């Protein structure tokens, strides 16, 4: 039925008694509770699937609310929502990275403490060793590529590269 | 991919015609974004509420030198028509300009004013094979 919800103030009753709505406002002050003013009275729908022992999927709690339009957009959804801080997302952010040991310590630090020195990555070492091997037979299939070119283009006052044949 | 239309042609596999979960396809290609509806005109591919504010992209947020094109989720405003200033949008091949201003555009996003897939086809971006396949489907004359 379409009716006006109504409230009888206890001073007006022929016995004073504590009205359930009044109690509800108490409960809302204590655990601070948003009272949705536009909540339609007609829409009480339990989630049948999870709340009835008749379905194999029965958790005892209302897993989803059955409201078709409801979306991450709405201020109401935003107000009760778990922020991503310190969830698994953070755990992924930190522990899943390309070389897993760089999660535990600075490579240079480790290398310098354990070995006497910084060590190149395995890949780099491969390219290094290969250059040494193939520079020993053929020469001049090569190129000279640096980060900063000035050191080669104007070399120091000394520096007379040994002629090759 | 078979043909590389961008860099990603090299990195990505098609995996045949593969199914993705509902409304998550890796690449957002909105072919439907201009899809005429008189009765749904104000609800389709627009803001879910008319009390929402216009997006970020209708405003100059910081100190700018200038822009090349404005974003396509920008919404066409009476000033877009009236002011007589360049309004560009990035579409393909290059850019679409709103040159001929109309009030009928107002209040919709430029997504909706720019036809993504044109009925027009360049024969010169097509291989002879591809042109054949476009003649089979009854698109290109031959």
């Amino acid at each position: 039925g379409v009716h006006r919800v109504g409230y009888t103030h206890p001073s007006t009753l022929p016995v004073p008694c504590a009205q359930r709505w009044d109690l509800r406002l108490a409960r809302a002050r204590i655990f601070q509770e948003y009272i949705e003013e536009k909540a339609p009275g007609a829409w009480q729908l339990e989630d049948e699937r999870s709340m009835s022992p008749e379905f194999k999927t029965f958790t005892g709690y209302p897993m989803r609310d059955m409201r078709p339009g409801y979306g991450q957009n709405l201020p109401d959804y935003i107000m009760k929502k778990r922020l991503p801080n310190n969830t698994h997302y953070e755990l992924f952010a930190r522990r899943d990275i390309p070389n897993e040991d760089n999660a535990m310590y600075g490579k240079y630090l480790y290398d310098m403490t354990v070995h006497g020195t910084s060590l190149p990555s395995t890949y780099r070492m491969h390219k290094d060793i290969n250059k040494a091997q193939r520079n020993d037979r053929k020469l001049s299939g090569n190129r000279f590529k640096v980060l900063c070119s000035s050191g080669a283009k104007n070399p120091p006052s000394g520096w007379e590269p040994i002629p090759d044949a | 991919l078979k043909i590389a239309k961008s860099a990603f042609g090299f990195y990505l596999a098609r995996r045949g015609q593969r199914k993705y979960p509902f409304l998550r396809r890796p690449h957002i290609k909105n072919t439907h974004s201009m899809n005429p509806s008189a009765p749904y005109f104000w609800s389709f591919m627009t803001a879910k509420s008319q009390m929402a504010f216009l997006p970020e992209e209708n405003y100059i947020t910081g100190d700018w030198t200038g822009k090349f094109f404005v974003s396509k989720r920008q919404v066409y405003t009476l000033q877009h028509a009236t002011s007589g200033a360049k309004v560009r949008v990035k579409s393909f091949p290059s850019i679409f300009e709103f040159n001929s201003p109309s009030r009928w555009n107002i209040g919709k996003e430029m997504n909706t004013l720019t036809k993504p897939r044109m009925d027009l086809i360049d024969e010169q971006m097509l291989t002879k094979k591809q042109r054949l396949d476009y003649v089979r489907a009854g698109l290109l004359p031959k």
């Binding site: - | 509806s37 009765p39 091949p93 001929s100 009928w104 009925d119 097509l126």
Partner: protein
């Protein structure tokens, strides 16, 4: 997995063609929109065939008895105000209450596309004779 062939270059003067084509596709779309709004509203405003399926009850009954009596004397004005559009018609029948639970349960209504025909429709072919130049989603005459 074969190395992807390179895409040929774009075209010469195709940037102009694409600009022009989209430009006047939009200009055309303005009139297509104007016209389909005109159509949509003309449809909302004009009368429709009766929404209920007369082959079932309580509708089959002779037009001088039962539901038709209930309509001629109590509901007529309202049924005409809403132009026999099937949604408000069905709602009015719910609110008249003198039928009550039956509207959805015992009574049958015509399918969507048939119920949308203009009043006076004689042959079924009419569904297919409406204008296709206009974007109303079958809400046009």
């Amino acid at each position: 997995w074969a190395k992807p062939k390179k895409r040929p270059k774009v075209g010469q003067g195709f940037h102009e063609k694409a600009q022009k084509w989209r430009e006047e596709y939009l200009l055309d779309r303005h009139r297509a929109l104007a016209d389909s709004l005109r159509a949509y509203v003309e449809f909302s405003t004009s009368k429709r065939v009766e929404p209920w399926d007369a082959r079932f009850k309580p509708f089959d009954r002779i037009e001088k008895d039962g539901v038709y009596v209930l309509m001629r004397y109590m509901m007529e004005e309202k049924l005409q105000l809403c132009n026999y559009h099937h949604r408000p018609v069905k709602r009015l029948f719910c609110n008249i209450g003198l039928m009550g639970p039956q509207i959805t349960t015992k009574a049958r209504w015509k399918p969507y596309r048939f119920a949308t025909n203009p009043a006076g429709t004689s042959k079924a072919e009419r569904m297919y004779q409406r204008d296709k130049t206009v974007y109303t989603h079958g809400h046009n005459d």
